[PDB]
């Protein structure tokens, strides 16, 4: 069935281990270094003048597949706002995701504000607070401050009757041999599974996505369906 929220508002929730870290920055790639056991990724996404999402995800390898399983809880949305009112354009602007180390948790934090394009020409801000904690006990790479620069295209499968989103994304790190064992799990093309269970103002929904990532070029290609 039709999602109760616009697909662009779920993009950031729906695997930063596929970012391209240039050779001179590979010692700053926390995400891959946490693999295969993975990390817990938590966010609060505050839609300005509207509600918020709170998310928790486990990102880890299961066999040959990188899996991202998320629970999302949305609260305090306006039923006639840009989100529940479906007033956002079907596209996605570039972001710079600013990353800093969180030595106490042996992980990272990240901050950025997404600008969703509204159909009337206005903008809907989605302010992101993020924290990632490794699940395993082994050493991880704790980075110097840097950012991830993103590029995204959203499209449709002309033969898909279900509500869905086709996504192509390129992400490269910027602003600063393998540097970790986990890095080497991403050398080729890696299959991806995404599962999201959501509840926004009591509207329940789920999303399943499948595709592949190529961290050497920072590329994600995925198709998501409402389930």
CATH number where 210 lies: 2.40.155.10
Residue 56 inside a domain? The answer is: yes
Q: Find the domain containing 24 and state its range.
A: 7-226
The Cα-based distances of 80 to 85, 182, 215 in angstroms read 5, 45, 39
Residue 1 inside a domain? The answer is: no
Cα distance between residue 14 and residue 195, in whole Å: 8
Residue 90 inside a domain? The answer is: yes
Contacts of 192 (CB under 8 A, 6+ apart): 15, 18, 65, 66, 67, 68, 209, 210, 211, 212, 213, 220, 222
Q: Are 9 and 154 in contact (CB under 8 A)?
A: no
Helix or strand holding residue 152 (H, E)? strand 146-155
Breaks (C-N over 2.5 A) in the chain follow: 14, 176
Biggest alpha carbon–alpha carbon distance for the chain: 53
* Tally of domains within the chain: 1
Residue 78 inside a domain? The answer is: yes
Residue among 138, 87, 85, 93 nearest 113 (CA) = 93
Cα distance between residue 56 and residue 132, in whole Å: 10
The DSSP secondary-structure symbol of 144 reads P
Other CB atoms within 10 Å distance of the CB of residue 218: 21
Residue 207 inside a domain? The answer is: yes
Q: How was this structure determined?
A: X-ray
Task: Give resolution, Å, one decimal.
Answer: 1.6
Q: Is 154 in a helix, a strand, or coil?
A: strand
Cα distance between residue 225 and residue 55, in whole Å: 19
Q: Is 171 in a helix, a strand, or coil?
A: strand
Q: What is the DSSP string of 29-97?
A: -HHHHTTTT-EEEEEEEEETTS-EEEEEEEEEEETTEEEEEEEEEEES--TTSTTTTT-B-S-----EE
Residue 145 inside a domain? The answer is: yes
Residue 2 inside a domain? The answer is: no
């Amino acid at each position: 069935g039709k999602l109760p929220v616009p697909w662009p508002t779920l993009v950031t929730t729906l695997v930063q281990c596929f970012s391209r870290y240039p050779d001179h920055m590979k010692r700053h790639d926390f995400f891959k270094s946490a693999m295969p056991e993975g990390y817990v990724q938590e966010r609060t996404i505050s839609f300005k003048d509207d509600g918020k999402y709170k998310t928790r995800a486990v990102v880890k390898f299961e066999g040959d597949t990188l899996v991202n399983r998320i629970e999302l809880k949305g609260t305090d949305f306006k039923e006639d706002g840009n989100i529940l009112g479906h007033k956002l354009e079907y596209n996605f602007n570039s972001d710079n995701v600013y990353i800093t180390a969180d030595k106490q948790k042996n992980g990272i934090k990240a901050n950025f504000t997404v600008r969703h394009n509204v159909e009337d020409g206005s903008v809907q801000l989605a302010d992101h607070y993020q924290q990632n904690t490794p699940i395993g006990d082994g050493p991880v790479l704790l980075p110097d401050n840097h950012y991830l620069s993103t590029q995204t295209v959203l499209s449709k499968d002309p033969n898909e009757k279900r509500d869905h989103m086709v996504l192509l994304e390129f992400v490269t790190a910027a602003g600063i041999g393998s540097a970790s064992q986990g890095e080497e799990l991403f050398t080729g093309v890696v299959p991806i599974l995404v599962e999201l269970d959501g509840d926004v103002n009591g509207h329940k929904f789920s999303v399943r996505g499948e595709g592949e990532g190529d961290a050497t070029i920072g590329k994600l290609t995925l198709k998501f369906i409402s389930t």
